[PDB]
Amino acid sequence: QRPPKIQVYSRHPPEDGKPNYLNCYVYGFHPPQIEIDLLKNGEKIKSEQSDLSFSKDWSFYLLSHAEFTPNSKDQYSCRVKHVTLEQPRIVKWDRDL
Amino acid sequence: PHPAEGQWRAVDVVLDCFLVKDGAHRGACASSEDRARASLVLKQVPVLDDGSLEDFTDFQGGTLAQDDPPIIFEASVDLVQIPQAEALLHADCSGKEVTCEISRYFLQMTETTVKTAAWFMANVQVSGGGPSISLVMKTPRVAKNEVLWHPTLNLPLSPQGTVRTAVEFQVMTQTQSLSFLLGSSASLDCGFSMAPGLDLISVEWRLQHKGRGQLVYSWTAGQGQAVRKGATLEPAQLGMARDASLTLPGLTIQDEGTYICQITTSLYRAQQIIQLNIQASPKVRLSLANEALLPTLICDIAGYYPLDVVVTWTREELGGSPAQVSGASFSSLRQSVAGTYSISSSLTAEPGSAGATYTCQVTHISLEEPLGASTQVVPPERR
Amino acid sequence: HSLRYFRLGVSDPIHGVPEFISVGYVDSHPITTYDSVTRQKEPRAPWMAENLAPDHWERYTQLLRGWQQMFKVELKRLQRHYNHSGSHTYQRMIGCELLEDGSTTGFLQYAYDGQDFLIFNKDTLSWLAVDNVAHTIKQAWEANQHELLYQKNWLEEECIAWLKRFLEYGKDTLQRTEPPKVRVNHKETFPGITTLYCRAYGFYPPEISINWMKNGEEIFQDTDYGGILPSGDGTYQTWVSVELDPQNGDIYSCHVEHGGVHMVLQGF
Numbered sequence: 001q002r003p004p005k006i007q008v009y010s011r012h013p014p015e016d017g018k019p020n021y022l023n024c025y026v027y028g029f030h031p032p033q034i035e036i037d038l039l040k041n042g043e044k045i046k047s048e049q050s051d052l053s054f055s056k057d058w059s060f061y062l063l064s065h066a067e068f069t070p071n072s073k074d075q076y077s078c079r080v081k082h083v084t085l086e087q088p089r090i091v092k093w094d095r096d097l
Numbered sequence: 098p099h100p101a102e103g104q105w106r107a108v109d110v111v112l113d114c115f116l117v118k119d120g121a122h123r124g125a126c127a128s129s130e131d132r133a134r135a136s137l138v139l140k141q142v143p144v145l146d147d148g149s150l151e152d153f154t155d156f157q158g159g160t161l162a163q164d165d166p167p168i169i170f171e172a173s174v175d176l177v178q179i180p181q182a183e184a185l186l187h188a189d190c191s192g193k194e195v196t197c198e199i200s201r202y203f204l205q206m207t208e209t210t211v212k213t214a215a216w217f218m219a220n221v222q223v224s225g226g227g228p229s230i231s232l233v234m235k236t237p238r239v240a241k242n243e244v245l246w247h248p249t250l251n252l253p254l255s256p257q258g259t260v261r262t263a264v265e266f267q268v269m270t271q272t273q274s275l276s277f278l279l280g281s282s283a284s285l286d287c288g289f290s291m292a293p294g295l296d297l298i299s300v301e302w303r304l305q306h307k308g309r310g311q312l313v314y315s316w317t318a319g320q321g322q323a324v325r326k327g328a329t330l331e332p333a334q335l336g337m338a339r340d341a342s343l344t345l346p347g348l349t350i351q352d353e354g355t356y357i358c359q360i361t362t363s364l365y366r367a368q369q370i371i372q373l374n375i376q377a378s379p380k381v382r383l384s385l386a387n388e389a390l391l392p393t394l395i396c397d398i399a400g401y402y403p404l405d406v407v408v409t410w411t412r413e414e415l416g417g418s419p420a421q422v423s424g425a426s427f428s429s430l431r432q433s434v435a436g437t438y439s440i441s442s443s444l445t446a447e448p449g450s451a452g453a454t455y456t457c458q459v460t461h462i463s464l465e466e467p468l469g470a471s472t473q474v475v476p477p478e479r480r
Numbered sequence: 481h482s483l484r485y486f487r488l489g490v491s492d493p494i495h496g497v498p499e500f501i502s503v504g505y506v507d508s509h510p511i512t513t514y515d516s517v518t519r520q521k522e523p524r525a526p527w528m529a530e531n532l533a534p535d536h537w538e539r540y541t542q543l544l545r546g547w548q549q550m551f552k553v554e555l556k557r558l559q560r561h562y563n564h565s566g567s568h569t570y571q572r573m574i575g576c577e578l579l580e581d582g583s584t585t586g587f588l589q590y591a592y593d594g595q596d597f598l599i600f601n602k603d604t605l606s607w608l609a610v611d612n613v614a615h616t617i618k619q620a621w622e623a624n625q626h627e628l629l630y631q632k633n634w635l636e637e638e639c640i641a642w643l644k645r646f647l648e649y650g651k652d653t654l655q656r657t658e659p660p661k662v663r664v665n666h667k668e669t670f671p672g673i674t675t676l677y678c679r680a681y682g683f684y685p686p687e688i689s690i691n692w693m694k695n696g697e698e699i700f701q702d703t704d705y706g707g708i709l710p711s712g713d714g715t716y717q718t719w720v721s722v723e724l725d726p727q728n729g730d731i732y733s734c735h736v737e738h739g740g741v742h743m744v745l746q747g748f
C-alpha cells in the first residue's frame with residue numbers, strides 16, 4: 001500500500017461572478033485504484049478524471065478537475081477514494097483566496 | 098574495536114552451512130537456498146572479563162561446538178578476524194540466530210570470473226540484520242584438462258569427506274542496517290582484511306537509489322576523493338584488519354537508500370551491502386479558535402519524514418461514550434528548509450452542553466510513543 | 481531530456497487491481513500507452529501517430545502482447561522464490577537521460593510490493609540487491625555473463641536511440657515553454673500566526689523557484705515549499721509561503737524566477 005497524497009487548487013484565481021476551473025492532484029499512490037471526487041458544500045459537482053501516470057518512485061500520478069462558479073460565501077473540498085483504504089481521504093481547499 | 102592486544106582466548110565455532118540446490122531449486126533461477134548440508138569452521142577471539150575457564154570461554158556458547166559433522170570446511174584463517182571476534186557473542190547476547198552459506202566462483206555456461214580454478218566463497222550472517230562477513234577462500238586442488246574437478250559443491254558438497262579451504266580475503270560489517278534522522282550527520286560501517294600475499298588497490302562507496310547505483314566516495318592508492326560527500330581514514334597496514342567506513346555530512350532525502358562498500362584487491366574483490374533509512378519525528382501544536390458557536394480546532398504537524406503522517410481527531414465527553422472523529426480534514430502538505438515535511442489539519446468542534454475535550458493524535462513510524470495535543474472547548478453559555 | 485518505459489502487473493490479481501500496464505513517456509508528456517484488456521498499442525501524442533506507420537503500431541502491439549504473457553510467467557516464478565501463496569504486486573522500470581553537455585545516462589530497477597528489489601549498475605556491470613530473494617537472484621544474474629552486454633545496451637543503446645528520435649519527432653511541440661503568473665496574499669493558517677502565501681501558475685516546463693526577502697535581507701525563518709502541480713492545460717503550478725509573527729511589521733518582497741524571467745513584487 002502507498003497512501004495517496006492530495007492537494008487541491010484552482011486553475012486561475014477564483015473570483016465571485018467569474019466561473020473557473022478546479023483541480024485536484026493525487027500523487028504517490030499504489031496501487032493505481034483511485035477515484036477523485038470534487039465537491040461544493042459537500043455536494044458532488046461535474047468533474048473529469050485523467051490518465052494514471054507512472055512515477056520513478058514505484059507510485060502513480062493522477063490529475064482530476066471540475067467546473068464551478070467561485071463564491072466567497074461557499075466552501076469547497078475534495079474526497080479521494082482508494083480501493084485498498086478503509087476510508088476515502090478528506091482534504092480541504094482554501095479557495096485560493 | 099581496538100585491536101585485540103588485551104586478554105583473550107581463541108575458541109572454535111561451528112555454524113550450519115547452507116547450499117543452493119542448483120539444478121533442483123524450488124524456484125526457477127537462483128544461486129542461494131536456505132537449506133543446510135554441512136557446517137563451517139569459525140574462529141572467535143573475544144576479550145575475557147573473568148577467565149573462569151582459563152583457556153576458554155562460553156561467550157559464544159550459542160555457536161560453539163566440539164563435535165564435527167560428517168561434512169565441515171576448515172576455513173583456515175590467514176587474515177585478521179578481530180573486528181568480528183565478538184560478532185557471535187553479541188548475537189548470543191541478543192539471542193539472534195546465526196547461519197552461514199557456501200558457494201562457488203566456478204562458471205560452466207560462461208567464462209569463470211576467477212579463471213577456472215578451485216575457488217569458493219562462504220558467507221556468515223547474524224539474523225535480524227546483524228554482523229555480516231563474506232569470505233573468499235581457495236582449495237588446493239590441481240587439474241589439467243578436466244571440467245568438473247573442483248568439485249563445484251553440487252548437488253552434493255563432496256563424494257566423500259570435505260575439501261580443504263583457506264580464507265585469503267574477506268569483507269565484513271558490524272551491521273546490515275543503519276538508521277539516522279533527516280538533516281542529521283551519519284556514517285557507514287564496514288571493513289576488510291587479507292593475507293600478506295594480497296595487496297589493496299582501492300575502496301569505493303556507492304549509494305543505491307533512484308534506479309541507479311552512484312559513487313559518493315572513493316579511496317585509491319592512498320588518496321581519498323569525494324564525488325558527492327564524505328570522508329575516510331587511511332586503511333590500516335598488514336597485521337590489523339583495515340577500516341572501510343565513511344563519514345557522512347548531514348543527510349538529505351536523496352541520500353536515503355542502500356549503501357555498498359566495495360573493496361578491490363590485486364587479485365579479488367568483494368562488498369557488503371548496508372541499508373540506510375532516514376526518518377524525522379513529527380512536532381505538534383494546537384490552538385482553539387475564539388468565540389463562534391462552533392469553535393474551530395487548528396493543529397499543525399510539522400518536521401517529519403517521510404511525508405503523509407497519519408492524524409486522527411478524538412472527541413471525549415464528561416462520561417457517556419467517548420468516540421473517535423472520522424471526519425475533520427487535512428491540507429497543505431509541504432516541505433521545509435530542512436527537507437522535512439509538514440501538514441495541517443482542522444476540525445469543527447461541538448462545545449456540547451457542559452463542555453467537551455478534543456485531541457489531535459499523530460501516528461508515525463518515527464514515534465515510539467503516541468504524539469498529539471489536547472484542548473477544552475467551552476460553550477458560549479459556559480463562559 | 482527523459483525517456484521512460486514502465487511495466488507493471490499483479491500475481492493473481494485481487495480486488496479488481498489492474499492485471500498488466502505498460503506506458504511510455506518522454507520529457508513531461510506521455511507518448512504511448514498499452515491496453516492489456518484489448519491488447520492494443522495506442523499513441524498519446526499526435527507526433528507519435530504521425531511518425532510511426534500502422535505497420536509499426538501493429539508489430540509493436542504483438543511484441544507487447546508477448547511481453548505481457550511472459551511477464552505473467554515471471555509473476556508466478558516470483559511467488560515460488562518468495563514462497564508466497566498469496567497475491568502480490570510486481571513491476572519494473574527502465575529509461576534514459578540525455579544531458580545538455582552531450583553526455584548520457586539511464587536506469588533499471590525492479591520492485592516487489594513497492595519495495596526495492598534489484599537495480600542494475602551499467603557502469604560496474606553488476607546488480608544491487610536488498611532482501612533475501614534479491615540477493616539470491618543477484619548472484620544468479622551476475623553469474624550469467626550472457627546478460628552482461630544485453631543489460632548494458634538495454635539501458636543505453638535502445639533507450640537513447642528512441643529518445644533522440646522522439647525529440648526530433650515532437651520537435652514542434654517539445655520546445656514549448658511559458659512564463660509563470662504570480663499572485664501573493666495574506667491568510668491565517670494558525671491562531672496568532674499570519675501566513676504570507678505566493679501562488680505561481682501557468683508555466684512550462686516546471687523550472688521554477690520562489691523565494692522571499694525581508695527588508696532587503698534574506699529571510700531567517702522557515703519556509704513552506706509546495707510541489708509541482710499540473711494545471712491540465714499543459715502547464716504546471718507551484719507555491720511558496722513563509723510564517724510571520726503577529727508582531728511582524730516588516731516589509732517582504734516576493735521573488736519568482738522561471739525560464740530566465742524574474743519578477744519581484746514590491747508589495748502585496
Ligand SMILES: CC(=O)Nc1nc2ncc(C=O)nc2c(=O)[nH]1
Binds near residue numbers: 486512638
Ligand atoms: C529490450 C527491451 O525491452 N527494450 C524495450 N523496448 C521497447 N520498445 C518499445 C516500447 C514501447 O512500445 N517499449 C519498450 C520497452 O519497454 N523496452
